[PDB]
Design a binder for these strands. Sequence first.
RNA 1: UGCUUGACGAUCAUAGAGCGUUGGAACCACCUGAUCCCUUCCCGAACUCAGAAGUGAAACGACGCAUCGCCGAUGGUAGUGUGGGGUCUCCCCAUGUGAGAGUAGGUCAUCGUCAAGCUC
RNA 2: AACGGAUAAAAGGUACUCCGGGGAUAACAGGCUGAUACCGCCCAAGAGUUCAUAUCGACGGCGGUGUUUGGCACCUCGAUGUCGGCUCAUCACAUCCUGGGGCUGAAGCCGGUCCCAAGGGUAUGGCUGUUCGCCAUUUAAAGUGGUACGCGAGCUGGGU
RNA 3: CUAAAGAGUAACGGAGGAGUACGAAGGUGCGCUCAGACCGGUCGGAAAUCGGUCGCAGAGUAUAAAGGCAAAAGCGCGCU
RNA 4: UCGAAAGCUAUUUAGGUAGCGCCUCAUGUAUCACUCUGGGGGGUAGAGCACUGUUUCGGCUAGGGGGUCACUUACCAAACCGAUGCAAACUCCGAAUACCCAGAAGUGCCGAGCAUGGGAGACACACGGCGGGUGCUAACGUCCGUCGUGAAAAGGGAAACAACCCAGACCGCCAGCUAAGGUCCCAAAGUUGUGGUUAAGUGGUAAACGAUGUGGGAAGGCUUAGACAGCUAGGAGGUUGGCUUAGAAGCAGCCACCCUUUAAAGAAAGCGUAAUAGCUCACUAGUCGAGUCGGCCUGCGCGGAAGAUGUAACG
Lengths: 137, 190, 75
Amino acid sequence: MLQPKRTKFRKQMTGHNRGLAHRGSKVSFGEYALKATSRGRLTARQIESARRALTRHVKRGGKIWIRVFPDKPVTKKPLEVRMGKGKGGVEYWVAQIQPGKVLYEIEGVSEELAREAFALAAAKLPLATSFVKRTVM
Amino acid sequence: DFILNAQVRSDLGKGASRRLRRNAGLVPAVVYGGDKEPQSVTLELREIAKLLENEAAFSHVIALNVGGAKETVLIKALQRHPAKGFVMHADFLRVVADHKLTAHVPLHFINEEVAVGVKQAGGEISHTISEVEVSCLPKDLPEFIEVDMAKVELGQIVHLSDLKAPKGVELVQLAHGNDLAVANIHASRV
Amino acid sequence: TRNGRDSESKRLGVKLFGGQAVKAGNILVRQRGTKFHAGYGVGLGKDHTLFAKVDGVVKFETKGAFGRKYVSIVA
RNA sequence: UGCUUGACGAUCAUAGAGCGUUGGAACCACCUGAUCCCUUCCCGAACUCAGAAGUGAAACGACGCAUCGCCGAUGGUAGUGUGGGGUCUCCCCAUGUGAGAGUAGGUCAUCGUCAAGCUC
RNA sequence: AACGGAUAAAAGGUACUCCGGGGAUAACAGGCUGAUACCGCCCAAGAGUUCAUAUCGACGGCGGUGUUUGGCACCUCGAUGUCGGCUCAUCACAUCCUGGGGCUGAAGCCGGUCCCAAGGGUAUGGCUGUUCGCCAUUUAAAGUGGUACGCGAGCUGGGU
RNA sequence: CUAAAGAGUAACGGAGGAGUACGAAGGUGCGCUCAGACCGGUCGGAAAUCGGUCGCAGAGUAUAAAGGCAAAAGCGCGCU
RNA sequence: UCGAAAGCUAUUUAGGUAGCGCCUCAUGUAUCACUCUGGGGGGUAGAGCACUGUUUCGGCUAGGGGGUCACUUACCAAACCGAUGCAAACUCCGAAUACCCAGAAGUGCCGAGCAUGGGAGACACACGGCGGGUGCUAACGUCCGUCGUGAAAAGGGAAACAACCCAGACCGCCAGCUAAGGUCCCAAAGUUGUGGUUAAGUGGUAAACGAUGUGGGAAGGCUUAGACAGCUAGGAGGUUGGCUUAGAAGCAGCCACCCUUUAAAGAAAGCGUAAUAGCUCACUAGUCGAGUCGGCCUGCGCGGAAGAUGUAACG
Ligand SMILES: [Mg+2]
Ligand SMILES: [Mg+2]
Ligand SMILES: [Mg+2]
Ligand SMILES: [Mg+2]
Ligand SMILES: [Mg+2]
Ligand SMILES: [Mg+2]
Ligand SMILES: [Mg+2]
Ligand SMILES: [Mg+2]
Ligand SMILES: [Mg+2]
Ligand SMILES: [Mg+2]
Ligand SMILES: [Mg+2]
Ligand SMILES: [Mg+2]
Ligand SMILES: [Mg+2]
Ligand SMILES: [Mg+2]
Ligand SMILES: [Mg+2]
Ligand SMILES: [Mg+2]
Ligand SMILES: [Mg+2]
Ligand SMILES: [Mg+2]
Ligand SMILES: [Mg+2]
Ligand SMILES: [Mg+2]
Ligand SMILES: [Mg+2]
Ligand SMILES: [Mg+2]
Ligand SMILES: [Mg+2]
Ligand SMILES: [Mg+2]
Ligand SMILES: [Mg+2]
Ligand SMILES: [Mg+2]
Ligand SMILES: [Mg+2]
Ligand SMILES: [Mg+2]
Ligand SMILES: [Mg+2]
Ligand SMILES: [Mg+2]
Ligand SMILES: [Mg+2]
Ligand SMILES: [Mg+2]
Ligand SMILES: [Mg+2]
Ligand SMILES: [Mg+2]
Ligand SMILES: [Mg+2]
Ligand SMILES: [Mg+2]
Ligand SMILES: [Mg+2]
Ligand SMILES: [Mg+2]
Ligand SMILES: [Mg+2]
Ligand SMILES: [Mg+2]
Ligand SMILES: [Mg+2]
Ligand SMILES: [Mg+2]
């Protein structure tokens, strides 16, 4: 389960998610990628589930990159607790996703296999995704 | 094979360029370099997109046709839509036969299914870096550069110094001192 | 263990901007350190207050070998 | 008439760094010695004094070179004031504005006062 | 230091209570919301002798309802009676029986699951104030909810 | 920090400190420049003191953070 | 005639009060606002990685750990190099606006500004937009900033509907023009004109996801050397592949899956036997005679879609 493993601050402001992902939108490293076409949050649990679904399908051969890291801590108020009396305590970690961000990458597999494994991973994810091949410029 | 038709464009700015991509599908573009001043042009989106399916579209000199004024240019940079992926803008560098240019030439890994590591050791080719950048004269601009794996074993790493410049091209990062790892055979992912 | 404290706002910053008429003694900048430095006709206080020593108009300038922003009073 | 050297400035990297070549007539530096002035929490290393045997090695100055650094458009993109709209966590249209990054490229500074020497 | 410091000098109980007020502010019910709850779906590693989808289904994802625990404090404090029982109900369908079907890891008998279907029907006792639950014995079945957790200007008063 | 590039700006919002210290740790004149790394060197070792190169403030600034700091605002000495 | 406030600061204060803010009146006095031009500072949006943290790959390499017990590395890893992301309490950068100042035209309803004084009220705010914290980017939630409205504002529209849209009612008129919103009937005004789309009453409530619904566009593969579909016929050996197995012999389990025969048949998908198996996918021959196949971008639709008094999610 991906986590920053240490941070300067425990808790963060909620913030917003407004960009169009002009960085992280290219297929580096690999040759096929899962690219987010919509906007949202990826929790660590979702990223791991997509990783496992994707890795189990390209069994015995391939290299996979996770280009999404959940570095944003998300707090929750417990049940039967009123408003106020402090923020609340970190529950899980999310990655902010803008349209265009590359989430996963693969190489060493055929394009037909890559599309199959990315469809498996994209069904675990709460975002609209698309399959992209590496491009020259 | 590479022909591109353009029209001189005089309406500039955010609103003008958004109207180009929205109403009458066209691509803003600029031509600079050489000995002339920059020239703002427009291109058909379907025309530039079709040209870019060619793997050599970036390492080959194009013949821009700016309203009847043919001119040899290189596709220097492209701006793509981050989500949809279509081309939003294109930078054309005027190619001059006397002045050296710098371009990113795609790599062609050959002898992949004959490598020592792949068969005798059962490794994976694992393309690390494609798209070497080269500084050469326009006549020496190659369409691609072979990596000719062939004799690569389970621990070998293909560096930038192990390639062969075709005629007179110079690998720019090699000149700086960065021996980039082009590829490496490693053990199969278990 | 918890929070809920803060100190009063110090009302720092530029009090007279470029081209403003100044009298001698007028406070030009309130600052913590020397974000601005004292140029011609400008004094420096204990707390790095920039004040006018002469009458004129404020001139802001960046100059010198260190890239210090200077406050000067010109005629 | 211009150049060279030195001191002080303007400016503060397009001016810097690195590498290489060069200057000793003068200037400057290294240099000689330390009784004298003065100095070392020890040491003439530095500071200081009296000099001119030696040398441009170090430093400094000048010249060259894009290796680094620094500068850097055009176009586009992001954002954004106002008015309007939508599918309204976020966007779009009209109009005004408009980066940062990156790309093409640029840079081995420019100027002033005074003193000495030389040149013409 | 309750740091613009009421006095030099000061803690508690009230179900024995009382006054002035407040729906400016809680408890009930209503409302908004839907984290939670319940119901459904998407993907499908796997279980199922083999076989993902007869029956299930991890890791994850998307909804619906208003339905539990909650959040809020909008109505009511010049008073909107509470839990349970009794009597009498009315509606929904996410159906417990009866009716019609598809698939089945459906031989038959009996089942499992899903679709359609709301016409009618849908226990009596022991214990407990109980709703519930456990137990006994039936039944074709002993449905799940809404109705001020339906119903005290209809009864009860065991609980509170 | 929130705080929306003048100021200000709330929450039982997110984080830390104070209720001191110093007659020198103040004034002035003079002088100096850190941290760290590498190499060489008796005990000596990762790390003590010494020498050299790099280093150019990544140190220091009584104390929390922020903003500053070469005329150093950092360090030493004499006189006060 | 004018016309607020529900703010700041303090308060045994919090639903009270006090100064300031905002209203009014009077007196005095000369400023003020809008815009243009010019001069400023900034560290936000965005961006970025130069610092501080946090990422992910790869290369090179300390150092750590193995085999020696003096040499070499099974295995982790500092630094550096390159690629690659994030940040309210990061910044090498960096707007728009906003704010401060100066000069200038016109307009101020005859004044805006300021000062002094008489009289207050008010210090429970609410919603909507935008920027945020908090909450679940839940609440007609809560807390700030900022603007608009209500408060204290009627009229018209949104069915009804403080806070939304248009517009600010001195009085009268059985005059006209417009705004938002509308024009088949209720109910004033086009059953207007032109060109398309939809068949779902979608319009007139919803997601992931599913689907030969249907319109447009740009490409691609095969194709009168016969494309796709349909129909007929064929679909072989060593060999029962080494081995394993009660029996694997084409498919259960590991590995191989090569070669010839021919217009073609991979050591055989699924119904599935105790192994041969029955059917049969790839492949070909004939017939057939003109299109055919599935991907992309996109407009409008479909399913997903269950609730309680009565149709009841166009009034
Ligand atoms: Mg615009
Ligand atoms: Mg000497
Ligand atoms: Mg020399
Ligand atoms: Mg630049
Ligand atoms: Mg720029
Ligand atoms: Mg007090
Ligand atoms: Mg009693
Ligand atoms: Mg009473
Ligand atoms: Mg109330
Ligand atoms: Mg309640
Ligand atoms: Mg009520
Ligand atoms: Mg009453
Ligand atoms: Mg039903
Ligand atoms: Mg019934
Ligand atoms: Mg009947
Ligand atoms: Mg009973
Ligand atoms: Mg009895
Ligand atoms: Mg009841
Ligand atoms: Mg009653
Ligand atoms: Mg009675
Ligand atoms: Mg501010
Ligand atoms: Mg501001
Ligand atoms: Mg040592
Ligand atoms: Mg050492
Ligand atoms: Mg000090
Ligand atoms: Mg009035
Ligand atoms: Mg008090
Ligand atoms: Mg930002
Ligand atoms: Mg002005
Ligand atoms: Mg009050
Ligand atoms: Mg108040
Ligand atoms: Mg308020
Ligand atoms: Mg409210
Ligand atoms: Mg309220
Ligand atoms: Mg009132
Ligand atoms: Mg109205
Ligand atoms: Mg009406
Ligand atoms: Mg009519
Ligand atoms: Mg008609
Ligand atoms: Mg409808
Ligand atoms: Mg056929
Ligand atoms: Mg639909």
